[PDB]
Design a binder for this molecule. Structure first.
Ligand SMILES: C[C@H](N)C(=O)N[C@@H](C)P(=O)(O)O
Ligand SMILES: [Zn+2]
Length: 455
């Protein structure tokens, strides 16, 4: 009976991320192509949205576990997400229409993501090794879903734009997101009834919905106003750095210092990882050309889940059987390093103004493999000496915005359309970032003896 209970929760996650990534691939292009955003702001706005999205399940996790139901909060978040993309199907209107929609997605995410995952931790089966195996199948469930989205939505965006100019076009794609949610939540979520935590308090339901609407407003204001989010992130940074400042204040130092390095490396990693949704997505837009009527530049992001699915069974194959396998951080950075250098040396070979189509295929292959290697991100993994549920998680949220400030180094002015000139600024970033990625590789191994010391 464990199988059925896991199958449903996995299918809802599949369609949820279908809608989510189906939106992610296109949103930054939407701000640039349909709306008139410059890559500078487009990167910042999307990256602040990502920061909020990452940091969202913090509040909502506690909501489903202590305030309302786990299954109920999950279902609620899914409906909120549904109305989130529902808001994305209306034309242009005030710019504030989108920011609000994003804010709704923020809130929806926070109520779905942690609880849907909590169910997998609970049912099938609960306090067993099976959990780790389960979360991998669940991990794959995301990748299969986000595949069909990141391939269909830009294709539907392109196709509908050809039949009817501007509207729906992009909004047709956002409607695809919407109906995806209405497919997962609309079917699978009510097909089975599994046991959760609370199982509804109307006073608590109300106070939650009110605060959720308010959070949509507050998110919209941080997204629209560039400087506001900048201050919000800065404040969050002084916060995280302060917590670590109090934690370190002889024997505990061996773990804490290591954790401090780990968290910053995690921060570093998220920076690299955001590039593909930002700067690398923009680089790919200034090269729609594809060899391998199709194929759209946003479709390049789909390489990520596709590569993960094909490299996963390769990595699971192990001849081993030990301890301090934190060297996988270094390898990861190292593999990310050459990935960026692929884009770095893209300007040299295969260029007709600005070409290199396969450069994205092999590049993303390297990104996905590096992401695959740093799977043990766990906040408890760094906690060897317990304020990591905050400081670390928040730091990992802050980093998402930092990825946009780093993407901004490759921001092409709106008046610059000549691909022969856009190419170098992108490669110069990618060539720099690869080098920076080697620096972390060194960092990861320099901190290795500190992991050897505590054990
Ligand atoms: C599909 C994508 N590569 C992925 O696995 N994402 C998970 C880490 P998330 O959907 O929880 O961010
Ligand atoms: Zn170089």
């Amino acid at each position: 009976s464990k199988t059925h209970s896991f199958m449903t929760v996995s299918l809802i996650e599949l369609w949820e991320r279908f809608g989510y990534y189906g939106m992610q691939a296109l949103i930054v292009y939407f701000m640039v192509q349909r709306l008139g955003f410059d890559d500078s702001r487009a990167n910042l706005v999307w990256s602040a949205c990502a920061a909020l999205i990452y940091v969202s399940p913090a509040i909502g996790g506690w909501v489903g576990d202590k305030i309302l139901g786990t299954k109920r909060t999950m279902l609620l978040g899914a409906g909120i997400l549904s109305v989130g993309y529902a808001l994305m199907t209306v034309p242009t209107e005030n710019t504030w229409f989108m920011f609000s929609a994003l804010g709704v997605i923020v809130v929806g995410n926070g109520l779905f993501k942690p609880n849907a995952g909590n169910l997998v931790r609970k049912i099938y089966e609960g306090d067993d090794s099976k959990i780790d195996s389960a979360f991998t199948i669940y991990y794959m469930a995301v990748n299969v879903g986000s595949t069909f989205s990141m391939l269909l939505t830009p294709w539907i965006k392109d196709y509908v734009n050809a039949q009817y100019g501007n509207e729906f076009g992009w909004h047709a794609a956002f409607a695809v997101c919407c109906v995806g949610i209405l497919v997962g939540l609309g079917n699978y979520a009510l097909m089975h009834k599994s046991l959760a935590n609370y199982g509804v308090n109307k006073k608590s339901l109300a106070i939650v919905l009110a605060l959720a609407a308010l959070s949509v407003v507050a998110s919209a204001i941080i997204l629209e106003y560039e400087d506001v989010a900048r201050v919000f992130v800065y404040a969050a940074g002084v916060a995280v750095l302060g917590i670590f400042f109090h934690l370190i204040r002889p024997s505990e130092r061996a773990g804490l210092i290591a954790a401090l390095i780990l968290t910053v490396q995690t921060v570093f990693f998220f920076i690299f990882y955001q590039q593909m949704s930002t700067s690398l997505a923009l680089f790919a837009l200034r090269n729609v050309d594809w060899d391998f009527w199709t194929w759209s530049p946003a479709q390049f992001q789909a390489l990520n889940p596709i590569w993960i699915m094909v490299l996963s069974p390769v990595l699971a194959w192990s001849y081993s059987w030990d301890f301090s396998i934190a060297a996988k951080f270094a390898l990861g950075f190292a593999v990310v390093a050459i990935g960026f250098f692929i884009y770095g040396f893209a300007g040299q070979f295969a260029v007709n103004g600005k070409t290199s189509s396969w450069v994205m295929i092999w590049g993303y292959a390297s990104y996905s493999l590096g992401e695959l290697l740093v799977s043990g991100l766990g906040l408890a993994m760094i906690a060897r000496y317990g304020f990591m549920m905050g400081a670390y998680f928040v730091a990992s949220g802050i980093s998402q915005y930092l990825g946009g400030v780093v993407a901004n180094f490759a921001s092409v002015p709106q008046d610059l359309v000549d691909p022969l000139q856009t190419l170098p600024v992108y490669t110069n970033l990618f060539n720099k970032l690869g080098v920076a990625a080697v620096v972390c590789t060194i960092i990861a191994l320099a901190v290795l003896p500190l992991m050897r010391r505590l054990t």
